[PDB]
Each structure stands twice: as C-alpha cells, then as structure tokens.
Ligand binder design. Structure first.
Ligand SMILES: CC1(C)CC(=O)c2cnc3ccc4ccccc4c3c2C1
Lengths: 494, 501
C-alpha cells in the first residue's frame, strides 16, 4: 500500500528528493483549483505553518488533510483535465467579445447608469471547483432578472412542481402573448416573465413577514455561491420601487385576477420583488451559483446539497427556453445553453455537467441582453461541443475540453465469475488490497463462492494466503463462515 | 492478442466454445446477429455446413474484432443491456393498459389499424436492439417525417439558407394558427406550413420522382437499410383529403414564402408522398438512433447527416415536436421527439438511443396515448431528461452505468476518506446529504475504518456531527470500539467507550 501522499509526491517530484513550495502551488493552480478554495484550507494552513523546501515526509504532512481532493486534482481527473489549455480559449473568446462596443447601458435608474460601458468580465466555475476569471470579475452588480431562476428554484425546492405551477405556467411565450400577461388558464406564461416572476415571489416562505423572506433567500443564495460574495444595493432597491409603477399595475391585475396565494399583501410582495432584484453578486460568486445549477443542486466548493434535483431540472429547463427575453427562442436554437440575462448586463450561464459561468458588461442590445455576453455565448458554443444537442462522439470541428479495487472485491462479494474474468483479461491486479488489506480471495472465501475461489487460484494464480488487517487468510475466512469445502480447497495449498 | 483475449472471455473457461454459447453471448450484449457490422463473422460462422477452438474463433471474429471487442469488454453506452430492456418491457406493459384515444379516421386507410396495436423499438448509439409488441407492422411516418426532411434539407443546404424560408421557434399555444411569424416565414419546420416550405427546398431543379428517390435513398441510410416502404393507398386518400394544405400552399405562395421558381402544387404533391412513406418501429428506431448518434448510423457506421443538421433537428424537435403539447413535453420529459397522426412518436435520447413507439389511438392533441404515457414513465424511471444531471440524479436509474453507485459511495468516498483520515472530505460528504452509514462487502463502516486506523478527528466528526450508529457490527461482529481496542488507539477507544451501554 505505497501511500497516497507520497504517490502524489512522486507525481510532482519528477526525481527531486525535495519539492519547493512554489512548485507545488503552481502545479496545484494548474489544475484550476485556487489556493483560496475552502476545500484546501487545511493544506494551505500547514503550508503557511511551515514558517523553503518540502521532502517526502514534510510534504505528506501538509497535503494529508486534503488528500482526497488533491488526489482527484493531480491524477488530472477533473471534469476538464487540461484546464490551462481551456482557460486560454476562454481568454480568446473574452478578448474577441471585448471588441463589440454596441449597446446602450440602462439609464432607467441612475445606479444602472453609474457603471462604465467598458466593464466586461467572465468567470468560470466548473462542477469540480476549477475557477477562472478574465476582466472585471470582482465588481459587484445587481442580479436583476438574473434572480428569476434562483427564486424559482428555491420555491420549487421548498414547495414542489405541482404547487408552484398551479400559479405559473411552464411554456415559452411564443410571440406577443407576452403583452397578454396571462395564458389560457389565466396564469403567467412561465416564471421568467415579470408577471411570472412576481407570482413566484408570492409563493416563497408564505406566512413569515418580508424581512424573514429576504433573510431566507439570502442565506440560500449564499449557500448557492459557496459563501462567496452575496450583497445588497439598497440604493438600487429604492429607485426600483420608485420606478416600478408598471409592476404595481401588473400586481393589481394579478391580485384582482386572483393569481396570488389567497391572502397575500400585494404591495408587500412587490417590495420583496424589488428587494430580490437588487441583490448583488460578482462574476466570481455568481459563477459558483451557476455551477451549482450545472452540478445538479450541489455546490462544488462546499459539497452542500442546496437545491433538489427537481428544482434544478425545472430551473434549467425554463432558462433554456425563456431566459433571454424575446431572444430566448433564438438563443435556444443557436447556443442551446440554459442562460438568464438581466438589465445590469449579467448573463447567468449554465453548461449542464461541466461548468457555471457569469458574464457581465452593462451595454444592452435592443432586447435587453448584454451585447458582449451574447457575443461570448455564441462564440463559446461554436468553439466547443457544449450545445445542448451537440453529440459527445461526433461533433466535427469543435473542441471537447472533457476499475477500482472496490470494483474487484464487490464482484468477489456477489460471486460474479464473469466480472472477474473481464477484470483479469483487463490486466487488473487481482491481488489488490482495500483499506482493510482485504483481497478478492478473502471476500470470495468468506462468502463460500467456490467458482470464484477456484478462478482466482487456478486461472489468475493469485497468492492463496494473503493476510487481512486481522492476519486472517482466505482459508481462515472459509472455516470461520461454514464453507468447509472452500476451506478444504485452500488447505490443499497448505 | 485481442482475438485470444476475447476468445477467453466468451469461453467461460471451457477451452472450446459451443456456437450457441457465442450467439447467446452476443445477443446478450444487444447486438443482433443481423448487424451489418457483423456480416463477415456470421458468414464465417455459417460455414457450419462444411464447436470453436482458439483458432476457429480467431478466424471468424477477426474482421469485426474492434466492434466485438468493445461489445464484450462491456463498453457499450448501456453495458447491462439485459437489465435495461426488462425496464423497457415494464414500461411497455404499463403503457399498454392505457386504453384512451381515437384511431385517426380522417382517412379510411388510417382508420383500419386496430387500436390495440402497441410497439416500442429501441436502438442505442452502439447498435444494441430491443423490441416489444407490434414492432414490425408497417405504418406511415406522417408528421414523423418533418424532422427527417428538415435534417436532409439542412444537410445539403446549411442553417443559413434553410432558415431564409422557415423560422426556428414555437408559435405559442395561443397563436397555434397564425401560420406566419413576424419575418413572414413559418414559425418552425414542425408545423404544416413550415413543413410544406421545407419540402420545397430539397433537391431543387429535378422532377418529383427524382426528388422522392433522393429522400428515399436518404431515409434508407438513416435506418441502416432496414424497412422503408410506401403505402399508395394512404397517399391517394391523403392527396384528396389534404384540401386544407392546398389552401395553406396558396396562402404560402401568395406571401412569397417559397424559393423563386417553385411549383407549389408540385411541392404539395411531394409533401403528401413523404407523409405516406412507411416504416416499422424497428426501422424507425435506427433512424431515431442516427439523430441520437451525431449523423452516424449506429448499425453501419456510415456518416449520413451533418452534425449541424442533427443539432438543428433535435433542437426543434425538443421545442416544437409534439403539437400543442410541445412545451409541456419539453418540461416533463425533456427529450427530442416527434409525433404523427398514425400514432408514431419518434424519440431521441441524445448520446444514448433512438427509439420508435407506435399505437394508433391519439389523444385530444394528436399524440399517441400509449406513447406519451411511455415517455413520461421512461424519464420518471431514468435520468434521460435533457436537464437531468449525470452525476447527482437522485433515485433515478442510469442505464449508462452498471449499478455501482454503491461502489463510488464506498469506493473511496466514505471508507477511503475515513481510511486516509480526510475529515475535510467527510465534511463535504455529510453536506452532500450522503448516507454516512454505507457498508462495504465486509459490512464495514467509515467509523469501523477510522477506528482501526485510530483517526480521532474522523471518529468524533462521525459521532458528534453526523450522529452515526456508534456500534455497528461488521462481518466478524466487531464494533468500532472493538477495532480500537485490538489496534491500540487508546484515545479512540476512550472516545467510543462513552457511547457504551
Ligand atoms: C398536472 C400535470 C399536467 C402537471 C404536473 O405537475 C405533472 C408532473 N409530472 C408528471 C409525470 C408523469 C405524468 C404522466 C401522465 C400524466 C401526467 C404526468 C405528470 C404531471 C401532470
């Protein structure tokens, strides 16, 4: 059992007796992990507490406490194994999109106009926590309609599909059925329209007052971003309630047409709605939110189950088809990713099973989508086979940036002679030990599996007397559990 | 040697292989002995006229050794095909009990089919096949042809050209009648007006019988040369009763929606021909699986459709493929499908399989009642939804994998983290809401392993946080405390001793 810590040491130390601390860090960062990663804190603490050269046993002390993640990182077995060559493509696409200067920054409130039109940031967070940023990725801005899928997920996670969609539909609008707010059953078309977003707000945490509702949603967004920046621009909040007269009118129509949960303080909901629109993110922290959606409801940098599988599935679905304003059908055809855009210039972008992403540049096009971000999303999917209906085998000129010993013993356990035959012809080591120094022979003996024991002995010619951590041989195991014939067979080897 | 290695795999130790041991071996991967990719091997097998040793076997499989190798090393997209198709038949039997719906009687040739006919046919990206029910009865494609000719059109002409004449979006159920969108093009190729315009784009400059021979040649490449027929009966009543699409054709011509120089009455004539083309569920599944496989026919390997044609085709099927039910189907089932008035539903599970379902009774929206029940059930059961996760998919079955989610749960996550002492990894697993009492084949527990290794901060985390069973008994009836005593770890023994009763 040559130890996992040294096994990695040999990976970094290409023959050197000791590894410099800075070689480890740049190798580390080369997988795309950041040293700020919460899952690497124990290791960085020890690195700093080595206060510059690390030998096999000093180094093994630092990496020991995060050895599972570092193992998966340096066996370059992340979802994107060659991250360095991936981040250059991201940088090329960023540089290219930076040259489109069209679009008008939203001035309907001054806080949206205070932002320079030159601001442009993209940040990547993969399902495994690899991070990458280019441009203005640590500037806070407001989510705006980028919060619509997030509050819809929360609702669905808490209440379930059937409840939520008693009050809101699940279809794209189609054309100008937008101005016809309500569909055939007199509900908003889907949660990504303002009328649907407003209704979704009325469903979240009913019974408590607004300040608890807002506290629930922020703690939730904070879990979704893995404790990265989730803020609030009160300035934006007050202008939004002052200019949101059109949404009050929409609210009165909704309350009169009985679309809210019966007994609902309408102006209370709309204050909540503007509160939620004003929540602040950076592209870094929003990308972790996106990567939580990209990763089935689990936050990559904390491991936490935040959203149920159903809430993610529904959210990603309606984002794919209702996420980009009147450009959503066009986006769905050509980009094929679930995204959501907002009037601060953010595009919350998700690549199911790979990464999340937030892009931000304030200039909006005629449809309200960020000009540089829309350019970026088209380029990304031309470059890589990320479209929803790209193939993972025959994808043409696009780039695709994408058996254990437990396997062995569980076959020995269940008696599957066919499986071990494949493994042996697979050139697997049939004498591998698990964490208990257990062997396929051990397990197959204890279960009295005669055709497995013989296969391991006669065909794979394995050692007949391995020792457990309790110093038992398969023969011991056979006797112990009543499998005398198996005991006899191995006894023939002494 | 790959031939010997494979020989040894099938010869389950008996030195010589009976021929039917080989066949049932093959048929159990889901390959058929009919497979075009296996012709050389079955022919050599067929010289049973003039039992297998290492050298006879190496002689037959030699020429299909790459496909046969990938087949038997269990590296098809669905490795455990036998157990997958038991689910398919469970879904089939269940859908068979839904009896609602009307057989389409708007023409007499379509009303002759018994409402009790029900077949599903599955063909995966790798040529694995499975069929249940009435899967070799010929029926007509009908609007199940809309994606295929749109695929053919884009394949020859490109995205930009085709969509000068047709849009790429749903209309919305409230405008399911407006025919033209704001660009004065039909909304998408899956509605009749858009379907009609697409037909006009295929092989311009030649006559109808040549046009129909080009589309037939194309369909044949899609189904791997399996059954593609033609029911003139259906075609003759369809041309006479299709009066409404003549109106649609003239309205289209009036608004200049065809390419300059287009005989509309001719295009309509072509259109009715293509609706009347015939398939079996078993041939339709191969066509479906070519859309699943990036334009490559699974059972012949031929590149038939451009990747661009397939991506465009699947998109529009996902969003416009099931009549006024397309948005809801897109929300709950999330697959690219297309339904037709004969009761066919052409189904694609991108990167896994193509599939055809057939039952004549349509519901109020035109979709086959048993086929719709089947597609909801498939995605209830498996993680095939387009926005299901392939890593964290809950209680759903993943037929791309073997049933080793217990391996991964054990196969490092709980016990190897416990083994190496990585408390940080265990914290993430707990926050994942993973079951922290997973046992391996020795009934061992993370707590077991961490005690035997004397990992004090792992033991406390498992006990004080997590609150796991403090005295689980392994094979040999040891508790974590027993393990601590055996191996020293006095502090660990002390920790656990407090939990004793
Ligand atoms: C009320 C509703 C339209 C909405 C809904 O919430 C839902 C969710 N999941 C479902 C799964 C399988 C199904 C099979 C057959 C008929 C329905 C459903 C079905 C439904 C039906």
């Amino acid at each position: 059992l040559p130890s996992l810590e040294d096994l990695l040491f040999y990976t970094i130390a290409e023959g050197q007796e000791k590894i410099p601390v800075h070689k480890f860090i740049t190798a580390l960062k080369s997988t795309g992990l950041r040293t700020s990663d919460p899952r690497l804190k124990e290791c960085m603490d020890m690195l700093r507490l080595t206060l510059v050269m690390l030998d096999k046993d000093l180094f093994k002390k630092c990496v020991q406490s995060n050895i599972v993640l570092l193992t998966q990182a340096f066996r370059r077995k992340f979802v994107i194994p060659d991250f360095m060559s991936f981040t250059s493509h991201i940088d090329e696409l960023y540089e290219s999109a930076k040259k489109q200067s069209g679009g008008k920054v939203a001035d309907y409130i001054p806080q949206l106009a205070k932002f320079s039109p030159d601001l442009w940031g993209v940040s990547v967070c993969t399902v495994d926590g690899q991070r990458h940023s280019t441009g203005d990725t640590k500037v806070p801005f407001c989510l705006q309609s980028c919060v619509k899928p997030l509050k819809y997920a929360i609702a669905v996670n808490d209440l379930g599909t059937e409840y939520v969609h008693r009050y809101v539909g699940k279809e794209p609008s189609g054309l100008r059925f937008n101005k016809l707010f309500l569909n055939e059953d007199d509900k908003p078309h889907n949660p990504m329209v303002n009328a649907g977003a407003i209704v979704v707000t009325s469903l979240i945490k009913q019974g408590v007052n607004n300040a608890e509702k807002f506290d629930y949603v922020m703690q939730f967004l904070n879990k979704m971003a893995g404790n990265e920046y989730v803020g609030f621009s009160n300035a934006t909040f007050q202008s939004e309630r002052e200019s949101g007269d059109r949404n009050f009118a929409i609210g009165y129509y909704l309350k009169e047409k009985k679309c809210f949960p019966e007994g609902t303080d309408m102006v209370g909901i709309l204050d909540f709605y503007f509160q939620l629109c004003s929540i602040e993110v950076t592209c870094e922290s929003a990308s972790v939110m996106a990567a939580t959606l990209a990763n089935g409801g689990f936050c990559p940098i904390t491991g936490e189950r935040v959203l149920s599988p159903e809430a993610v599935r529904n959210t990603l679905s309606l984002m794919h088809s209702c996420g980009m304003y009147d450009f959503s059908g066009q986006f769905a055809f050509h980009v094929g990713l679930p995204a959501k855009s907002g009037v601060a210039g953010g595009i919350l972008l998700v690549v199911p099973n790979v990464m999340g992403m937030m892009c931000w540049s304030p200039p909006l096009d005629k449809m309200g989508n960020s000009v540089k971000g829309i350019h970026f999303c088209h380029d990304l999917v031309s470059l890589c086979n990320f479209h929803n209906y790209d193939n993972l085998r025959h994808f043409a000129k696009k780039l695709d940036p994408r058996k254990s010993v437990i396997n062995l013993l569980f076959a020995a356990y269940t008696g599957d002679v066919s499986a071990l035959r494949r493994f042996a012809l697979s050139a697997m080591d049939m004498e591998q030990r698990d964490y208990d120094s257990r062997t396929a022979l051990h397990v197959a003996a204890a279960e009295g599996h005669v055709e497995v024991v013989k296969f391991l002995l006669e065909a794979c010619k394995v050692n007949p007397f391995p020792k457990d951590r309790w110093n038992n041989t398969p023969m011991d195991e056979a006797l112990h559990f009543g499998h005398h014939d198996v005991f006899k067979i191995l006894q023939e080897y002494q």
